[PDB]
Scaffold this active site. Sequence first.
Site, PDB file in Angstrom:
ATOM      1  N   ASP C  31     -29.657 -10.161  -2.357  1.00  0.00           N
ATOM      2  CA  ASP C  31     -29.704  -9.593  -1.018  1.00  0.00           C
ATOM      3  C   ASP C  31     -29.828  -8.080  -1.196  1.00  0.00           C
ATOM      4  O   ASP C  31     -28.825  -7.383  -1.359  1.00  0.00           O
ATOM      5  CB  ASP C  31     -28.460  -9.968  -0.208  1.00  0.00           C
ATOM      6  CG  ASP C  31     -28.520  -9.467   1.233  1.00  0.00           C
ATOM      7  OD1 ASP C  31     -29.199  -8.449   1.494  1.00  0.00           O
ATOM      8  OD2 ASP C  31     -27.883 -10.095   2.107  1.00  0.00           O
ATOM      9  N   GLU C 123     -16.600  -6.369  -1.293  1.00  0.00           N
ATOM     10  CA  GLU C 123     -17.528  -6.957  -0.339  1.00  0.00           C
ATOM     11  C   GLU C 123     -16.893  -8.250   0.167  1.00  0.00           C
ATOM     12  O   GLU C 123     -17.191  -9.332  -0.340  1.00  0.00           O
ATOM     13  CB  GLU C 123     -18.894  -7.209  -0.974  1.00  0.00           C
ATOM     14  CG  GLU C 123     -20.000  -7.466   0.040  1.00  0.00           C
ATOM     15  CD  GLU C 123     -20.159  -8.935   0.374  1.00  0.00           C
ATOM     16  OE1 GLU C 123     -19.440  -9.427   1.274  1.00  0.00           O
ATOM     17  OE2 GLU C 123     -21.005  -9.599  -0.264  1.00  0.00           O
ATOM     18  N   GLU C 132     -14.049 -16.750   5.812  1.00  0.00           N
ATOM     19  CA  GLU C 132     -13.545 -16.779   4.429  1.00  0.00           C
ATOM     20  C   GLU C 132     -12.207 -16.051   4.287  1.00  0.00           C
ATOM     21  O   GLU C 132     -11.504 -16.232   3.289  1.00  0.00           O
ATOM     22  CB  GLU C 132     -14.565 -16.208   3.435  1.00  0.00           C
ATOM     23  CG  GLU C 132     -15.912 -16.920   3.476  1.00  0.00           C
ATOM     24  CD  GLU C 132     -16.917 -16.349   2.485  1.00  0.00           C
ATOM     25  OE1 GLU C 132     -16.526 -16.058   1.334  1.00  0.00           O
ATOM     26  OE2 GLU C 132     -18.096 -16.183   2.862  1.00  0.00           O
ATOM     27  N   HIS C 280     -28.264 -11.961   4.060  1.00  0.00           N
ATOM     28  CA  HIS C 280     -27.839 -13.337   3.839  1.00  0.00           C
ATOM     29  C   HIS C 280     -26.761 -13.758   4.848  1.00  0.00           C
ATOM     30  O   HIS C 280     -26.392 -14.927   4.915  1.00  0.00           O
ATOM     31  CB  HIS C 280     -27.327 -13.515   2.408  1.00  0.00           C
ATOM     32  CG  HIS C 280     -25.980 -12.906   2.161  1.00  0.00           C
ATOM     33  ND1 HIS C 280     -25.801 -11.556   1.944  1.00  0.00           N
ATOM     34  CD2 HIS C 280     -24.750 -13.467   2.086  1.00  0.00           C
ATOM     35  CE1 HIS C 280     -24.518 -11.312   1.750  1.00  0.00           C
ATOM     36  NE2 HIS C 280     -23.857 -12.453   1.830  1.00  0.00           N
TER      37      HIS C 280
HETATM   38  N1  LIG Z   1      -7.858 -13.080  -3.199  1.00  0.00           N
HETATM   39  C1  LIG Z   1      -8.867 -12.835  -4.152  1.00  0.00           C
HETATM   40  N2  LIG Z   1      -8.575 -12.290  -5.346  1.00  0.00           N
HETATM   41  C2  LIG Z   1      -9.542 -12.062  -6.244  1.00  0.00           C
HETATM   42  N3  LIG Z   1     -10.828 -12.368  -5.991  1.00  0.00           N
HETATM   43  C3  LIG Z   1     -11.184 -12.915  -4.816  1.00  0.00           C
HETATM   44  C4  LIG Z   1     -10.194 -13.160  -3.867  1.00  0.00           C
HETATM   45  N4  LIG Z   1     -10.795 -13.703  -2.790  1.00  0.00           N
HETATM   46  C5  LIG Z   1     -12.110 -13.800  -3.042  1.00  0.00           C
HETATM   47  N5  LIG Z   1     -12.344 -13.333  -4.270  1.00  0.00           N
HETATM   48  C6  LIG Z   1     -13.617 -13.207  -4.986  1.00  0.00           C
HETATM   49  O1  LIG Z   1     -14.398 -12.061  -4.528  1.00  0.00           O
HETATM   50  C7  LIG Z   1     -15.734 -12.371  -4.639  1.00  0.00           C
HETATM   51  C8  LIG Z   1     -16.364 -12.087  -3.373  1.00  0.00           C
HETATM   52  N6  LIG Z   1     -17.776 -11.720  -3.542  1.00  0.00           N
HETATM   53  C9  LIG Z   1     -18.139 -10.350  -4.015  1.00  0.00           C
HETATM   54  C10 LIG Z   1     -18.928 -10.150  -5.311  1.00  0.00           C
HETATM   55  C11 LIG Z   1     -19.208  -8.730  -5.757  1.00  0.00           C
HETATM   56  N7  LIG Z   1     -18.148  -7.810  -5.354  1.00  0.00           N
HETATM   57  C12 LIG Z   1     -20.494  -8.408  -5.137  1.00  0.00           C
HETATM   58  O2  LIG Z   1     -20.525  -7.671  -4.119  1.00  0.00           O
HETATM   59  O3  LIG Z   1     -21.534  -8.857  -5.603  1.00  0.00           O
HETATM   60  C13 LIG Z   1     -18.669 -12.779  -3.881  1.00  0.00           C
HETATM   61  C14 LIG Z   1     -18.645 -12.265  -2.545  1.00  0.00           C
HETATM   62  C15 LIG Z   1     -15.788 -13.845  -4.992  1.00  0.00           C
HETATM   63  O4  LIG Z   1     -16.241 -13.950  -6.292  1.00  0.00           O
HETATM   64  C16 LIG Z   1     -14.451 -14.344  -4.880  1.00  0.00           C
HETATM   65  O5  LIG Z   1     -14.185 -15.276  -5.928  1.00  0.00           O
END
Ligand SMILES: Nc1ncnc2c1ncn2[C@@H]1O[C@H](C[N+]2(CC[C@H](N)C(=O)O)CC2)[C@@H](O)[C@H]1O
Lengths: 343, 343, 341, 343
Positions: C31, C123, C132, C280
């Site tokens: 994206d 993000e 979420e 997205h």
């Molecule tokens: N409570 C949490 N502690 C640690 N990690 C967490 C928690 N909740 C969600 N997440 C993770 O953050 C991620 C959210 N994301 C962001 C990816 C990266 N910062 C980007 O911008 O590319 C993919 C969209 C996703 O992988 C989740 O597993």
Amino acid sequence: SVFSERTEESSAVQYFQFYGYLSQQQNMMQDYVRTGTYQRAILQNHTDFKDKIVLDVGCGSGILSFFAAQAGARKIYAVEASTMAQHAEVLVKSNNLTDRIVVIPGKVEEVSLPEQVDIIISEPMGYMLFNERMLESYLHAKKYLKPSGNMFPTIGDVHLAPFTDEQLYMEQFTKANFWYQPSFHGVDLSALRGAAVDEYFRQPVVDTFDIRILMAKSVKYTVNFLEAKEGDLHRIEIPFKFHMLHSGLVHGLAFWFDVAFIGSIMTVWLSTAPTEPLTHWYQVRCLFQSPLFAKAGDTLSGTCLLIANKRQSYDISIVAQVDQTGSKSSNLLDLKNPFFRYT
Amino acid sequence: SVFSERTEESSAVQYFQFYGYLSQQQNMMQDYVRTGTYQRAILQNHTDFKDKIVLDVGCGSGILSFFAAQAGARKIYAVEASTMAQHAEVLVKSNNLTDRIVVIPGKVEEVSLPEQVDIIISEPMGYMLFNERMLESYLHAKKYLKPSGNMFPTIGDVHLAPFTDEQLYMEQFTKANFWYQPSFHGVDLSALRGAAVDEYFRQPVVDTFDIRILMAKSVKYTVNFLEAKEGDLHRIEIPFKFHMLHSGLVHGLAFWFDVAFIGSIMTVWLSTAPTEPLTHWYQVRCLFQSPLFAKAGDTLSGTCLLIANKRQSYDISIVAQVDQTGSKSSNLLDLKNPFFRYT
Amino acid sequence: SVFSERTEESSAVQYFQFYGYLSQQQNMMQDYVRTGTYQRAILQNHTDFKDKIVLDVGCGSGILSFFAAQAGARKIYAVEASTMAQHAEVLVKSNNLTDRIVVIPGKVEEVSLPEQVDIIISEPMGYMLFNERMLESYLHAKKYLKPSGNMFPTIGDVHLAPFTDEQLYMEQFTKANFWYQPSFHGVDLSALRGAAVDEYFRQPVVDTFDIRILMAKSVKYTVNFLEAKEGDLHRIEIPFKFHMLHSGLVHGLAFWFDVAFIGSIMTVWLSTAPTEPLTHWYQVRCLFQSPLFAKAGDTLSGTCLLIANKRQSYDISIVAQVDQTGSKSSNLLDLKNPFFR
Amino acid sequence: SVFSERTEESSAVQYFQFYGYLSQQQNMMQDYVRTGTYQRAILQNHTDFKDKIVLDVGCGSGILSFFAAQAGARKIYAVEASTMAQHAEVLVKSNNLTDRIVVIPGKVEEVSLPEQVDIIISEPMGYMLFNERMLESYLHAKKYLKPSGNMFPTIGDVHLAPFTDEQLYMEQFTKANFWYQPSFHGVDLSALRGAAVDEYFRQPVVDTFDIRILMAKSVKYTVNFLEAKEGDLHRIEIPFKFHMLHSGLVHGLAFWFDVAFIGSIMTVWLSTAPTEPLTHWYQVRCLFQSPLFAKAGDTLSGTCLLIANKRQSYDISIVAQVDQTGSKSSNLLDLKNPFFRYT
Ligand SMILES: Nc1ncnc2c1ncn2[C@@H]1O[C@H](C[N+]2(CC[C@H](N)C(=O)O)CC2)[C@@H](O)[C@H]1O
Ligand SMILES: Nc1ncnc2c1ncn2[C@@H]1O[C@H](C[N+]2(CC[C@H](N)C(=O)O)CC2)[C@@H](O)[C@H]1O
Ligand SMILES: Nc1ncnc2c1ncn2[C@@H]1O[C@H](C[N+]2(CC[C@H](N)C(=O)O)CC2)[C@@H](O)[C@H]1O
Ligand SMILES: Nc1ncnc2c1ncn2[C@@H]1O[C@H](C[N+]2(CC[C@H](N)C(=O)O)CC2)[C@@H](O)[C@H]1O
């Protein structure tokens, strides 16, 4: 009953069969100007309804009665003669208002009400106001109205104005001239051309138009529903004297109408004028058999006489003359069989 | 009278008032397929008319009687119940046929004729052939027909075929869904949604369409006017078994009809099929409230039952099922109150 | 833990398994509006990162942490709960940034950091911004933020506006009407028609649309991430009063969101509005079971109530009325089960 | 319970939440091949149902039970574990069959049935037949089946065939190569390219294809539900030896399945083969990590081992070799996480 005496049964049957259809009720309900203005008139004058006894003449779906309920009415008698009455009853129950709205099936001329009412509400207006003759039922209902009771609508104004529309006029002959041919599949039809012309000109034309076709300020005939008697509507004589604002050929008279809800808080108007947003009433035009030439500043004088008939409509007689020239025109129209021209 | 016994007066008044208008006669006369085909059937079978006695049932303007006169008929009795009868007399005189065409005002069930006739001519077909129930007057008139006499038209074929038309179905459902609103100006209408769906879907749809919406070869039901008795038309049962040529949703059944003039010289056909030039009859479609899904090769079986009513029309019940799955649909339509979609 | 207490295990497992896939990280990374705007926000505000301590909440592949490193951060703690954390570490090593990016596997609600941070990056935006419930983790993370510390994104705006779209409405109604059949293979299903309508209309519609379907200027609801506490997101009440610009049928409410990165050098906006390039996140529309007729000049008033649930999503309640007529509509939607159109 | 012991709770929650949706039941019901074939199998074998005791395992909406009712079953026990059970109960009531159909909420492994049954009906087939592991519930239900009882379906055949699809194979690398760039927004992603490839190849591909990609007659593995024990489905070893009909590169194995209803009157087949109209099961393809070159006339031999896991799915192990050349390839796939490729 007063109703049966003034109405041929066939007409009555057709009439109430018509309003028995949900689609027709829907057609009226979907007229936002009409329905919205009724709701506004009722709600904005809530003191005329709060804890009052109401009669709804010809309730149809019951919409106006629900508006009366929204305004805080204590009891609403909703009278309806078509089978729609049972659908109204269904809605009163489903809207949990059986304690305030009582549907009474039958004609308002024939049913019995248990008590006198504070205010009568109704939507009895037809084309050029008077068509369908339901105003007489509305006025008839005042036998149930307390002295000093009110009527919503309170007054009705019918407006008449001379117009010019060469194409509308010519259209009649264009259609009638079908019969003016000596060998339609070997048949000479011409002998009926006159009768065909007559027939077309007997039809009031239902549709709308540009206000610029109007040639003089309208003349207004007012019915005060608080004062009028049913009998007053059997013979309606509307004299007129138009002061021509434009020069040209006058092809006939245009008709529209307003009603006013004169409440304690405010007066609310519902207008079907060609200067206003369109309603399902459109406007009505009655053609002259022969157009009349007038100059700006000339006066066009005469009479529109509406004679009620047993087909729940009117025979229309219009006589007009240009005072400055003495040129005269007449027409007789049958309001029961209008020509719906709008497209 | 046989007519009065099977007809509510209201319906009759309305009915004959309708055909009393010259504009309506003009509308029918200007259907060139209709008028031209009648003339063709009569003139190309002139030997069936030359020096014969003719009865014209419901002559209207008298056009068919003029065709009979063109074909050399000795005497034509033109029966007409509406006021149009007066106009027909005018044309008989202006066309110098007073010695040959005799207008007899009244109902064919009620008038008296001076002699038996060689041939009966009429145009008694309504929408879906049977609407208006005028075929019964036509058959009734056979009391004046010589044993070796003929009928023009001689036979009528009703065709029915299943169709698919998502847009029409949704068009009607959209209209019905007005009554689904839980808060129309604050009013809950939903309790009436079922009643509204029923009403809209009771309406046969009158208009034309592309033949490609048809999903199977038509089924044909034939009425022989020479053999049939009017009583035969009180209850018309049309069984059908369609062999589906395409897979999809069956939204209802389409209807049209042909009539044949079986003369001594040739048989002339008048068709209202959608494969043929358009007529004022268009075609008629009866919608299902819920369509039936079928696959090519499936059989769609059932019955179309027409029960005559006192409003000069029929109560229509259509029951259809997809034999392979048992998916069934039942429907009720009111042929008296169709939806004119052609506008 | 704060996370476990508000989250059913089934949902959590499914959720982090979902984000454990490289294809999903790839989908997000591709994206370009999103990724490019984040990079722009971070690099154009390099002074907010130069020699600073950073926390990346939910680093995924680690992309934002790499942006933080590019901007000159001294040390970045990159917290990630899914197995993606192992992949991020691979990238940290292959990019020779072991001295600057430190992957911390686990949930931000549960892990321990050695020090307080100057700035939090994340993000955490889902459909309608809030889906979420990751914003709560983002806000929770402020326990590691120094006083006067900053957050990227800094604020989030949720926009709502009434729309007209007969085709979508009938599209859904058509699906629901399957259960209207009185003889499906000989079986009468009609008794379930009501339940089917409810189910289908409970689904928010995720997709984009022409801005001309919008019938009034949008209403804005703003969350300031610097001030908000996670508890603020359990029950979100959004009142609205639309001044109708067009007459017609209101079939429901359209939703989108913007976030702003308010840095020392400049403010950078990331928008998912239908007037902007597609992301997205697309846009989200909540349909009414029955549309509301309105005239231009009318006011459409009501409330959108979002109640967070244990499935990391929201129960949506929308109540709207045309003030002039009293025409009222109430609707309940399940953001957990959207329709991807 | 047997169900809980073989199923991770999370998976069960998700699983039954999935089928709790009317849209999913609808999705299955709208598969005309599936539903129509079940109905045909049941009705055309009416002697297997007439006055019989029936068990419906996982009745969902209850459709199959209604089919059993159409066939004249005396009593039908309809077991359903999702909340859909309440929707089925509504339909049982609305279809006036409470005297014949008894809805039992819960898992067939856990509920109590009062009586032994004559026949079990169910639709427990998933992708590649076995996915979702519902066949084990189906077989488990035989504890309620009389010794002389029947199973509908009676047998299930899983078909495997080698295929060639260069584009599908290349697609994996095209997608994985996203990670093979040294400066994606300044980041070297290349170190993860291998892991991305592995991930893509672990996913069975769900979709349909042209039968011409198939390079040999399928090998068939049959489960006889009347004879089988649920334990038989924990480890499914499918040896294969394909006789290559075409020369080329074999990129993997395609999977589909048939079930047969072996009734007293006739055997009815339900097929999801690519030679048949598409169903909601589509077909499934598992890629080899490296393609194998084969000549027409060569034999491609090896094994597909399906190992059941606690996520209600299977780990797929495929080992294949070209006997004539000794060229060998293997793959390990996770059927729980397929890639839906269909467009
Ligand atoms: N409570 C949490 N502690 C640690 N990690 C967490 C928690 N909740 C969600 N997440 C993770 O953050 C991620 C959210 N994301 C962001 C990816 C990266 N910062 C980007 O911008 O590319 C993919 C969209 C996703 O992988 C989740 O597993
Ligand atoms: N004499 C009568 N007694 C009782 N009911 C009568 C009588 N004459 C006409 N009506 C009925 O009034 C109705 C007239 N209208 C009004 C419908 C409703 N109030 C609205 O505003 O939507 C439709 C326009 C129509 O349904 C007629 O059947
Ligand atoms: N029972 C009856 N007795 C006498 N006349 C009857 C009866 N029923 C209907 N009609 C009339 O037949 C006419 C039917 N039609 C035919 C007009 C003319 N023959 C043509 O083809 O142009 C217009 C279509 C219509 O005028 C009706 O008034
Ligand atoms: N162990 C179980 N006990 C009771 N019910 C179970 C069990 N496992 C799955 N199920 C249910 O069976 C259903 C499987 N299906 C069949 C639906 C219906 N019979 C049709 O053919 O349309 C949808 C395909 C699904 O609803 C599941 O919830």
